[PDB]
Design a protein around this nucleic acid. Structure first.
Ligand SMILES: [K+]
Ligand SMILES: [K+]
Ligand SMILES: [K+]
Ligand SMILES: [Mg+2]
Ligand SMILES: [Mg+2]
Ligand SMILES: [Mg+2]
Ligand SMILES: [Mg+2]
Ligand SMILES: [Mg+2]
Ligand SMILES: [Mg+2]
Ligand SMILES: [Mg+2]
Ligand SMILES: [Mg+2]
Ligand SMILES: [Mg+2]
Ligand SMILES: [Mg+2]
Ligand SMILES: [Mg+2]
Ligand SMILES: [Mg+2]
Ligand SMILES: [Mg+2]
Ligand SMILES: [Mg+2]
Ligand SMILES: [Mg+2]
Ligand SMILES: [Mg+2]
Ligand SMILES: [Mg+2]
Ligand SMILES: [Mg+2]
Ligand SMILES: [Mg+2]
Lengths: 135, 187, 49, 175, 153, 125
RNA sequence: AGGAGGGCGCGGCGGCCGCUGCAAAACCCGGGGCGCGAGCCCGGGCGGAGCGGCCGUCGGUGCAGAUCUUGGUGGUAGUAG
RNA sequence: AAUUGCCGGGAGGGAAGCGGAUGGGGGCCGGCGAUGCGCCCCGGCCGUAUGCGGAACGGCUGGUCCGCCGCUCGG
């Protein structure tokens, strides 16, 4: 079952999709799944309708990519790496496992953006926010 | 103020998508939307339009029609119908034909394959004939329906052979006073 | 209705719309029937340009 | 109404313009939104035009501010486009200042200021950031009081404020 | 019990209350309005004078069809006033209750004034009357709730 | 964070369409109802009468649904729903649902401070 | 007059995702907003035990009129008497 | 909710209410509005190569991570 077929089955309703404000122009949608970098309900970003996916979540930052020949076996579907180095070294590994490999090069900018937000979130976790970012 | 009808807007309606919700048909529509955008083929443009059509606008085609429309031109020619291929017991010889259709009956699929032919889907015809080269586009009989027999002029006007809507058939069901000269008139 | 049709063939469907008409007997008699609805004359180069 | 780009010449600027191929020039954070970077603008905004009735040494009436109505002598037009003015500070008490071209009226009375040095006065001199300013003001009036004394009654004219009175129509007055 | 107004000086004030008192609401509302900021001793003498027909009560609203007397001419130049005895006696009883409540608190009866007085409509009681042509019509009383707070200042 | 919206928000009408004659009758509510009487002044659009909503009043697509603080609102009920705005913290703000308790409001407000997500009603309850 | 499309709201059933004694539903408010609009979201209060959103499907599903039904309440009026 | 009392506020020459537009007064609000970002003296971590452990991508080469070493110096 290819990703295009899976997308049409899960597009309308989903255990991870959150919809709000009805079906007018007011509608706001998001996705809750991991391996969904921007948490957006779209084919490009969906963690359910794509064979190759990247997950950038904290724990230390865990990067996870899925194996294409292990779709039928969920227990071995995720190849996970845990990195505790400096940001640039982590940013280099994300570019290596996502861009240079040709494993979803279209996600290299969303993945680096999410790694920035996750690393920044961890930065303030150890030392509380001493300045607010309104400028 | 400018003198126009309905403001100049188009009042005719047409289908720009299939009314059905079949995901495999939605995937066919996406594929053929791409083909008519970037190949500019007249054949692909017709396929996309018929993929939107309703059930009564895509009549079934039988084997008898197919084996006669594809008579000598069954080598290097794929028959294309946007609809269903049904079987026909009234014929005995079935040549080897390449046929693509939305659906085959299990008797028609068996008849084609046993004769040496192939049954293709429209996603397979796109690989073989991306621009529809060396193909025969076919349609079933649009007006071979019992409903169409009641269409047209009213049954009670001269020169009309429209079917009436009668609950039963017999001598006591609409055969007197309007159907023969011995009772009034005969329209 | 006759005035409405003629002003459609001259493409004058709105007030203060303007067109160029070439002169012959066919067009002039069309113009005479819609005379109360229209102002026209002979343009010069400055007007055309 | 001159057409600068009237001819497809473009070479009177770069005559020896036959040159070689151009050589085109870690973020530490990624902004999650493709924001086009802000570089400095390479547009030249064509400095403002001086009113043709304002010439060096002409007299100006101030129309607004705390010195409204002060009759003041004009010196120079600064690079930003503000006019440079002095009172002079002795007669009417108006120091050296830069004024917008609006809020002044150019009269037809003129003063020669050729032998007066106004060079160190410029936009940087007025940068928002005084004893030496008193010296510069002091050394610019004595170079100008005499030329004011050269014309009869010009001293009492510069020391009086302009005002409109009953029946005065500003759109008919010559000034 | 919560009244509609707090004393704002609860130690220096006393209250009295009455629910479902069988006296016309419209008459008692005017009586309560006539003594709004009155001192306690002047209020008692005013209400006794009303009982004795020596001082009238001014009827300002609920006044249609009320006579003119000249006893009410001060503070009501048109003579519209009356002497509602039942409504005056009912208020007098409440004034004596609040007065004794103040004596228990030890506040002096002198320098006491009405800082709050309110008449609210109680649930109406039903009786009957008979009309021509065998018809029955309602015959209703309009009782009231009265609230009263005396304050020193 | 810093709002990404830069186009100015213009409103064609900061004023409600109150239902005609809802001032006259206590039982009539202000929610708009399209008049449909044959002689209706409001339906016939006589001048000086009540205005009727129509599609021409609609707001720019680029700025519609944006709050005055130049963010678009998303209602959350727990921490996990608030995590979904971390990649959209420049375009979306979080509002905690009305029935979420004070204990969980503390947790959402803490997590949103770490993630630099703006909460519109963080001082409530 | 009339037709049609797309949406808003009410109550169930099958599913999914949640909330709530650190205060649910309902109700109140010259509180703040979003939507052309039907409506929605939040704040403060009251209250003290339950409630919501999304997908599908179903219905005794939306009131200003009917000398409409039942109940409650005015002016008339402290009047006629 | 209709309707009523009180307290406080506002208006009123044979109705009032209503639409649009401002103003005067009030009641609200602070995501109502910023204080950070690049260069330098103080605090504090490691390439290159290695042994080892797991698990990847493409269709046999090459890849990342972690913990440990032993040279290294820029962060
Ligand atoms: K009387
Ligand atoms: K439902
Ligand atoms: K009042
Ligand atoms: Mg028009
Ligand atoms: Mg029309
Ligand atoms: Mg005949
Ligand atoms: Mg009488
Ligand atoms: Mg009787
Ligand atoms: Mg009797
Ligand atoms: Mg609005
Ligand atoms: Mg709340
Ligand atoms: Mg209210
Ligand atoms: Mg509900
Ligand atoms: Mg039911
Ligand atoms: Mg019903
Ligand atoms: Mg009703
Ligand atoms: Mg109706
Ligand atoms: Mg009635
Ligand atoms: Mg009734
Ligand atoms: Mg009555
Ligand atoms: Mg009487
Ligand atoms: Mg009420």
């Amino acid at each position: 079952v290819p990703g295009s077929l899976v997308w049409e089955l899960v597009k309308k309703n989903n255990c991870f999709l959150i919809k709000q404000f009805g079906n007018s122009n007011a509608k706001v949608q998001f996705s809750k799944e991991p391996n969904n970098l921007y948490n957006v309900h779209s084919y490009k970003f969906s963690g359910l309708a794509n064979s190759k996916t990247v997950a950038v979540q904290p724990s230390a930052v865990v990067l996870s990519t899925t194996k294409t020949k292990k779709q039928n076996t969920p227990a071995k579907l995720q190849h996970k790496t845990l990195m505790r180095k400096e940001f640039r070294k982590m940013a280099k590994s994300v570019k290596n496992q996502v861009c240079d490999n040709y494993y979803r090069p279209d996600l290299t900018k969303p993945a680096l953006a999410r790694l920035s937000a996750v690393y920044r979130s961890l930065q303030v976790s150890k030392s509380g926010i001493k300045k607010k970012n309104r400028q | 103020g400018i003198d126009l009808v309905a403001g100049g807007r188009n009042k005719r309606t047409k289908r720009v998508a299939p009314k059905s919700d079949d995901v495999y048909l939605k995937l066919l529509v996406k594929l053929y939307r791409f083909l008519v955008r970037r190949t500019k083929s007249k054949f692909n443009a017709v396929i996309l339009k018929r993929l939107f059509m309703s059930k009564t606008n895509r009549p079934p085609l039988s084997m008898r029609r197919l084996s006669n429309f594809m008579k000598g031109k069954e080598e290097k020619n794929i028959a294309v119908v946007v609809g269903t291929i049904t079987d026909d017991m009234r014929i005995q010889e079935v040549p080897a034909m390449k046929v693509t259709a939305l659906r085959f009956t299990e008797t028609a699929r068996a008849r084609i394959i046993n004769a040496g032919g192939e049954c293709l889907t429209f996603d397979q015809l796109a690989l073989r004939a991306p621009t529809g080269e060396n193909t025969i586009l076919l349609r079933g009989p649009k007006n071979a329906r019992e409903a169409v027999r009641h269409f047209g002029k009213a049954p009670g006007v001269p020169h009309s052979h429209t079917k009436p809507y009668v609950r039963s058939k017999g001598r006591k069901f609409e055969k007197a006073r309007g159907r023969r000269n011995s009772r009034g008139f005969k329209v | 209705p006759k005035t409405k049709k003629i002003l459609q063939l001259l493409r004058l469907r709105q007030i203060f719309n303007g067109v160029f008409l070439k002169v012959n007997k066919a067009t002039i008699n069309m113009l005479r029937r819609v005379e109360p609805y229209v102002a026209y004359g002979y343009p010069n180069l400055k007007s055309v340009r | 109404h001159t057409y600068h780009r009237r001819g497809l010449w473009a070479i009177k600027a770069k005559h020896g313009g036959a040159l070689p191929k151009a050589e085109k020039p870690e973020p530490k954070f990624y902004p999650a939104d493709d924001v086009k970077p802000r570089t400095v603008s390479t547009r030249k905004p064509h400095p403002t035009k001086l009113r043709s009735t304002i010439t060096p040494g002409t007299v100006l009436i101030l129309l607004a501010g705390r010195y409204m109505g002060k009759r003041v002598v004009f010196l120079k037009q600064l690079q930003s486009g503000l006019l440079l003015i002095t009172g002079p500070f002795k007669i009417n008490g108006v120091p050296i200042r830069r004024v917008n071209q609006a809020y002044v009226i150019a009269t037809s009375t003129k003063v020669d200021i050729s032998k007066v040095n106004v060079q160190k006065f410029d936009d940087k001199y007025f940068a928002r950031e005084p004893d030496f300013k008193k010296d510069d003001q002091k050394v610019i009036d004595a170079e100008l009081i005499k030329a004011i004394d050269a014309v009869p009654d010009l001293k009492n004219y510069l020391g009086a404020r302009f005002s409109l009175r009953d029946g005065d129509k500003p759109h008919e007055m010559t000034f | 019990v919560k009244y509609s107004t707090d004393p704002a000086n609860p130690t220096k004030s006393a209250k009295a209350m009455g629910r479902d008192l069988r006296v016309h609401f419209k008459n008692t509302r005017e009586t309560a309005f006539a003594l709004r900021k009155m001192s306690l001793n002047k209020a008692k003498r005013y209400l006794e004078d009303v009982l004795a027909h020596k001082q009238a009560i001014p009827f300002r609203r609920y006044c249609r069809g009320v006579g003119r007397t000249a006893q009410v001419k001060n503070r009501q130049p048109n003579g519209q006033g009356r002497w509602p005895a039942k409504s005056a006696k009912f208020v007098l009883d409440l004034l004596k209750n609040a007065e004794s409540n103040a004596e228990v608190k030890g506040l002096d009866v002198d320098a006491l004034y009405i800082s709050h007085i309110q008449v609210n409509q109680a649930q109406k009681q039903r009786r009957r009357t008979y009309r021509a042509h065998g018809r029955i019509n309602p015959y209703m009383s309009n009782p009231c709730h009265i609230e009263l707070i005396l304050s020193e200042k | 964070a810093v709002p990404l919206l830069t186009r100015k928000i213009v409103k064609k009408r900061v004023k409600h369409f109150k239902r005609a004659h809802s001032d006259r009758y206590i039982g009539l509510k202000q929610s708009w109802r399209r008049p449909k009487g044959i002689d209706s002044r409001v339906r016939r659009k006589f001048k000086g009468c009540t205005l009727m909503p129509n599609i021409g009043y609609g707001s720019d697509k680029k700025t519609r649904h944006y709050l005055p603080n130049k963010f678009k609102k998303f209602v959350v009920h727990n921490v996990s729903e608030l995590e979904l705005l971390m990649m959209h913290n420049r375009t979306y703000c979080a509002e905690i649902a009305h029935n979420v308790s004070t204990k969980k409001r503390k947790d959402i407000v803490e997590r949103a401070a770490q993630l630099d997500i703006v909460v519109t009603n963080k001082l409530a309850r």
